[PDB]
Design a protein around this nucleic acid. Structure first.
Ligand SMILES: [Ca+2]
Ligand SMILES: [Ca+2]
Ligand SMILES: [Ca+2]
Length: 71
RNA sequence: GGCCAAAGGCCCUUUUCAGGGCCACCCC
């Protein structure tokens, strides 16, 4: 119950997926939230012990959730 | 420590609110 991912391979791939998400306009238009809840869209911990599907699963849900953030 | 979200095990891509691959489970 305490793990930090070391594999540079895994961390890059995961960073990329995250970087993608921040590069969206929805994330830009998320200057309207003070660190908040879990009902919000929070980027997955890249350092978390996660399975491949698990992390990808989270990321999918992350990006979708983002889209609540622009008309 | 535990519990939850996510999660079949991995793998590719800016088709990325997305598309795909291998294996496994299923239906034998
Ligand atoms: Ca679940
Ligand atoms: Ca599932
Ligand atoms: Ca399946």
């Amino acid at each position: 119950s305490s793990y930090t991912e070391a594999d540079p391979a895994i961390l890059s791939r995961r960073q990329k997926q995250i970087d993608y998400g921040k590069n969206t306009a929805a994330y830009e238009r998320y200057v309207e939230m003070v660190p908040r809840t879990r009902d919000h869209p929070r980027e997955p911990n890249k350092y978390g012990k996660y399975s491949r599907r698990a992390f990808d699963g989270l990321v999918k849900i992350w990006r979708k959730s983002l889209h609540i953030y622009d008309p």
